[PDB]
Design a binder for these strands. Structure first.
Lengths: 119, 82, 137, 59, 47, 94, 175
RNA sequence: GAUUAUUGGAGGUAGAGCACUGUUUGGACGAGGGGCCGGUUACCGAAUUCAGACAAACUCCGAAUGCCAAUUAAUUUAACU
RNA sequence: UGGGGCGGUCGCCUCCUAAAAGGUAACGGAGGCGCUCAAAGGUUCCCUCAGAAUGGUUGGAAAUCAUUCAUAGAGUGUAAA
RNA sequence: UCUGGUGACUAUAGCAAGGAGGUCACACCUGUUCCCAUGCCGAACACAGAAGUUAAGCUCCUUAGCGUCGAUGGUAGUCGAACUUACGUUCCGCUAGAGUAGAACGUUGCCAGGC
C-alpha cells in the first residue's frame, strides 16, 4: 500500500531550509514566488519588517496571454520590473522558493533580470 | 613495603575552562568571546559567529541577550545600542 | 525473571544510608506483609535465611512475594591489609531500605501464622520491623 | 519505466492459435508472420499455450 | 602518507604542504591555489 | 455524612502545621464544581468514622461557616508509616 | 491499457455495488509493481547476475539494478559493496501490457491448480510473492536460462488491503 | 571596592521519575527453539502487556543556595596600577 | 610510593568522583591516542533513519526485496561525551 | 473578508475523530513531442493541455477522544539559626517534582484580488 500527496509542503520545507540564510532586509527585499498549476504569482517583500513591497501575477490581467506556460511569466517579470522601476529598481534578494532555476522560473527570472533590475 | 600490586584507571585530562564568559546585560568588544562550548547548546543569533570549536563570538560591540529560540531551544542576540 | 542479567560497572559507591522510603510502602501482591523502621543495608543472605525460615514454618503453606533485589554490590579487601593500592573485589550484593518500605508480603495463609513466620524471619535479621495488613479505607 | 536502465519492450501481437490473445508485450521482437492490424503488426510467434485452451479449472 | 611538499613553477620557494595517502593517491597530484608572487590562483604540482 | 471543618489561614508555618497534624485534626483543600481552592481542617477521628460508615465514596454534607456542601474526595496525602493522614483533597459535585 | 477498461467495467459493476465510492475521483486503481529479484549472490556470480539482469531486460522494459549490501551480515558473504540486488518499477503502459502478457502465460507453465494461486500477501495490498521462473520468459523458454530465480513481487494499489487485491484479482486473475 | 532590597540571566546538583539506557520484579498474553510427530503440551528465550521497583558513570523534570552582570537603588569603605 | 623494596606507572584526549558558574585530590573509578580522508575535503542540487513488526524465491529468524510505525534509537572515519 | 505567501506570537496554536465546502486560487489530472528528467521510472522533476475534482489534499464546523499546558494546597528538599547526639530535633524563609482542579481544537501583519 502507498499514498500520493501534495508537493507544496515539500516545496515549503525546502523553502524554509533556504530562508535560513536568505531574508528580505527591506533593502534587498525577498522576492517571494508561487506557481500553483496554471498561473505564477510573485511579491517583493520586506522581511526586516515582514511587509510587502509589490504584488504581481500571471493571472493579473496586465500581463495576460495564452502563450507558452512560460512567456507569460516572462511578461510578468518585465511588468514587475517596470513596477520596480518606481523603486526597488536595484539589485535585490531573489528567492527560488522550493523550486529550481529552470523552466518557468528561469524564464521569468531572466525577464526581471534584464527588464532593468540587477540582483 | 611488600608486594603492592598495580592498577590502571589513573588517567585523565586537563580540563577546559568552558561555558560562558559574559552575562545578560554587559557590554562587549568586537573580537570578544561569549561562550566556549561543544556542539550547539545555544545557537548564535544576531551579530554572532560560530567559529571552529563551536566557540561563539559577538561580531560587534554591544550588549548581550540570551533568549529562547524555538518552542524549546535557546539562542543569543547582541544589540549595539550603547 | 524479567531482568537484564548483566550490569554496567562493578565497583560502585556505598549508597545513602539516611533518608526515607521513596515508595514501596503499601501492600500490593499479598494481603499481609512486613515493613521496616530502620534504614540499613541487607546482605543477600538474611533474606535467604528468612524466607527459608518462613517457608519451612509454613510447611509449604501460603504464597509469598519479595519486593526486593540487590541491584548493587559492595567490596572487601582481604584481612586487614595495608591501604590504598586499588579497590577490592566484590564479596556480596546488597539493597538498602527505608523505614516504611515494604519487604515481604504473603497471602493464602492465616494472619497469626504469617505474624509468627515474619517474627521468626526478623530474628536472623539486622533491622527493626513491623507487621502490616492490606491498607484500606 | 526506469530510463537509464530501460531496454525496449513492445506491445507485441501474441497471436496464438488458442483464441489469439495478442495483448501482451516483451522483447519478443520476432518476425511478424501475421502482419495483422487488429493486433500488433509484429510477431505472432506465441504459437501454442494452454492459458486460454486448457486451464486446470476450466480445461 | 608522507609530508608532501609541492614545488611551484616559478614562485621560487619550497612552500606548500599537505597530506596525501600513497594507497589512495600514489601519483603526483596538482591543483589550483594562490601563489602570492602573482596575485592569482595558479596551478602547482607535486615534485 | 454531615461533617464539619474549620478554615485555615495564610502562612501556616512548618511549626503550626506539624502541631495541627500532630493534633487530632488534619488539613484539607477542596476545589471543583461549586467551590474554589478552599483550605480548611477537620477532625481525623470523625473523618475516619464517616470513612468506615460510607466507604471510599460518598456525597457528604460539608459544614464550613454556615453552608452544607455536597463533596467527595479528589485525593489525599496520607502517611502509611504511622498510618495517619497529612492532607486531604476534596472535589465538589454540586 | 488492455485490462484497463476491463477493470473500469468491473469496478462500476461490482465495487460500485459493494464499496460504492462516492465519487469517480476516489476509485480503486492499482499503482505499480516492484519486481526486485532477490539475492543473486554475486560474490563471484557477477555473470549470473548479468544473466538475471538480461532476463528482466527482455521480460520487463527496465532491467534491475544491483543493490550493494549495506551490511556485513554473517551467515552470508556481503559487506559495504557486495552487489546483491535487483530492482524494477513498473508503473505505466508497460505495467498493463506486461500484466496481460504474464497472466496469459502464467497458468500454462506455472502449473498452478488455482490458476495462479490463492495468496502469499503480507497484509497490506502487497503480495510478497516468490517464484521459480516457469511461465516467465515465454519469449525465451527455459532452454538457455542458467538459474532459477523468483522475484519478490509486491502489488502497489490505491486499494486498502489484500482483501481488495483479491477483488481486483477478479480481473484476469485466478485467486 | 564591599554589603544588602531590586532585576535579569547561565546551569541540571538534591529531590523526584521511567520518558530513553538500562537493572529488576511478579503475573499475564500469545507465539517461538522445543516436550513430539512440522507441530500439540510443558519448557524456557524473546516480544507484548498489566503492575511494579533501582540507578555515580539513566534522565522526560527540577529546587534551595551559590555564580555573573546590571544607570541596578540604599549603607558602608574601599579598589586598582 | 600509607617506610624502603618487588610490582606498577611517568606524555595527551573523553566521562564519574567534582558538591546545579567555572575550578578541584586520591597506587580513586571507566574508556581512548601516538592517525586517517584528494574525498570521509570545498561548493552547488537532490534524498532522508535504522530497528521493529508487517513475510515473504532467499527464509539460518532475519541476507536481498515488500507496508506502517519508527526519534535520529539509524547513521554520523577513528574512544566516551 | 476567501485566497496567497508574507507572517509574529511556544500547541491551551496541536494529534486523532465526525461533518460541510469547490477547477475565483488550490489539486485530481492529459500525455512526454518540446527544455529537463532521474548510479535505477513523465515516479519525481520539467515540458505542453485543462479534459473532468472536491473524492483526495485543502478551508470551516464539532470531540479535548489523544496530546498539551496547568492551578490551589501540600509534601520532600534546602539556606540560616538554636538545640542537643541524633541514620538527628526544633524555629524561621525559599519553597520543587509528582499529583490535582481546569483549560484550550488559536491570536495574529503586510499586500492584491476576493471581497
Amino acid at each position: 500500500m502507498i499514498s500520493k500527496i501534495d508537493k507544496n509542503k515539500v516545496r515549503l520545507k525546502r523553502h524554509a531550509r533556504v530562508r535560513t540564510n536568505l531574508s528580505g532586509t527591506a533593502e534587498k527585499p525577498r522576492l517571494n514566488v508561487y506557481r500553483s498549476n496554471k498561473h505564477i504569482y510573485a511579491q517583493i517583500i520586506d522581511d526586516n519588517k515582514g511587509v510587502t513591497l509589490a504584488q504581481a501575477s500571471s493571472k493579473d490581467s496586465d500581463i495576460a496571454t495564452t502563450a507558452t506556460k512560460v512567456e507569460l511569466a516572462t511578461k510578468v517579470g518585465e511588468a514587475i520590473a517596470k513596477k520596480a522601476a518606481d523603486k526597488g529598481i536595484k539589485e535585490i534578494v531573489f528567492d527560488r522558493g522550493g523550486y529550481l532555476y529552470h523552466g518557468r522560473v528561469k524564464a521569468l527570472a531572466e525577464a526581471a533580470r534584464e527588464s532593468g533590475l540587477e540582483f | 613495603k611488600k608486594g603492592v600490586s598495580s592498577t590502571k584507571n589513573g588517567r585523565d585530562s586537563e580540563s577546559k575552562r568552558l561555558g560562558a564568559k559574559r552575562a545578560d546585560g554587559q557590554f562587549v568588544t568586537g573580537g570578544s568571546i561569549l561562550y566556549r562550548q561543544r556542539g550547539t547548546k545555544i545557537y548564535p543569533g544576531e551579530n554572532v559567529g560560530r567559529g571552529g570549536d563551536d566557540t561563539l563570538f559577538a561580531k560587534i560591540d554591544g550588549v548581550v541577550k540570551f533568549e529562547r529560540k524555538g518552542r524549546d531551544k535557546k539562542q543569543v542576540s547582541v544589540y549595539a545600542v550603547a | 525473571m524479567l531482568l537484564p542479567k548483566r550490569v554496567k560497572y562493578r565497583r560502585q559507591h556505598r549508597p545513602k544510608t539516611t533518608g526515607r522510603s521513596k515508595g514501596g510502602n503499601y501492600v500490593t501482591f499479598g494481603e499481609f506483609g512486613l515493613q521496616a523502621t530502620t534504614t540499613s543495608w541487607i546482605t543477600s543472605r538474611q533474606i535467604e535465611s528468612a524466607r527459608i525460615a518462613m517457608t519451612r514454618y509454613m510447611k509449604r503453606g501460603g504464597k509469598v512475594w519479595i519486593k526486593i533485589f540487590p541491584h548493587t554490590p559492595y567490596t572487601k579487601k582481604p584481612l586487614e591489609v595495608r591501604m590504598g593500592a586499588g579497590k577490592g573485589a566484590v564479596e556480596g550484593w546488597i539493597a538498602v531500605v527505608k523505614p516504611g518500605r515494604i519487604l515481604f508480603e504473603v497471602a493464602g495463609v492465616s494472619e497469626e501464622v504469617a505474624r509468627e513466620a515474619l517474627r521468626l524471619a526478623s530474628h536472623k535479621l539486622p533491622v527493626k520491623t513491623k507487621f502490616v495488613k492490606r491498607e484500606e479505607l | 519505466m526506469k530510463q537509464g536502465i530501460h531496454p525496449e519492450y513492445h506491445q507485441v501481437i501474441f497471436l496464438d492459435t488458442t483464441t489469439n490473445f495478442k495483448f501482451l508485450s516483451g522483447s519478443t521482437k520476432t518476425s511478424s508472420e501475421m502482419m495483422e492490424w487488429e493486433d500488433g503488426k509484429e510477431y505472432p510467434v506465441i504459437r501454442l499455450d494452454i492459458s486460454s485452451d486448457s486451464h486446470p479449472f476450466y480445461t | 602518507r608522507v609530508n608532501v611538499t609541492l614545488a611551484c613553477t616559478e614562485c621560487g620557494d619550497r612552500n606548500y604542504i599537505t597530506t596525501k595517502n600513497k594507497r589512495n593517491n600514489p601519483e603526483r597530484i596538482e591543483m589550483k591555489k594562490y601563489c602570492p608572487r602573482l596575485n592569482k590562483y595558479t596551478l602547482h604540482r607535486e615534485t | 455524612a454531615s461533617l464539619k471543618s474549620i478554615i485555615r489561614q495564610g502562612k501556616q508555618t512548618r511549626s503550626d502545621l506539624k502541631q495541627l497534624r500532630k493534633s487530632g485534626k488534619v488539613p484539607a483543600v477542596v476545589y471543583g464544581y461549586g467551590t474554589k481552592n478552599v483550605s480548611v481542617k477537620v477532625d481525623e477521628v470523625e473523618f475516619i468514622k464517616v470513612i468506615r460508615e460510607v466507604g471510599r465514596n460518598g456525597v457528604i454534607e460539608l459544614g464550613v461557616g454556615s453552608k452544607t456542601i455536597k463533596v467527595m474526595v479528589a485525593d489525599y496525602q496520607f502517611d502509611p508509616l504511622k498510618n495517619q493522614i497529612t492532607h486531604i483533597d476534596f472535589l465538589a459535585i454540586n | 491499457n488492455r485490462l484497463k477498461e476491463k477493470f473500469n467495467t468491473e469496478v462500476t459493476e461490482n465495487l460500485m455495488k459493494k464499496f460504492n465510492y462516492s465519487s469517480v475521483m476516489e476509485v480503486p486503481k492499482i499503482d505499480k509493481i516492484v519486481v526486485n529479484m532477490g539475492v543473486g549472490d554475486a560474490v563471484q556470480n557477477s555473470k549470473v547476475l548479468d544473466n538475471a539482469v538480461e532476463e528482466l531486460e527482455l521480460i520487463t522494459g527496465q532491467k534491475p539494478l544491483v543493490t550493494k549490501a549495506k551490511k556485513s551480515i554473517a551467515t552470508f558473504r556481503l559487506r559495504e559493496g557486495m552487489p546483491i540486488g535487483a530492482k524494477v518499477t513498473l508503473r505505466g503502459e508497460r505495467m498493463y501490457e506486461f500484466l496481460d502478457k504474464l497472466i496469459s502465460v502464467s497458468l500454462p507453465r506455472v502449473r498452478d491448480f488455482q490458476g495462479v494461486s490463492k495468496k502469499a500477501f503480507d497484509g497490506r495490498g502487497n503480495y510478497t510473492l516468490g517464484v521459480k521462473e516457469q511461465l516467465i520468459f515465454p519469449e525465451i523458454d527455459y532452454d538457455k536460462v542458467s538459474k532459477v530465480r523468483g522475484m519478490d513481487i509486491v502489488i502497489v494499489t490505491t486499494a486498502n488491503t489484500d482483501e481488495e487485491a483479491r477483488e481486483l484479482l477478479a480481473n484476469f486473475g485466478m485467486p
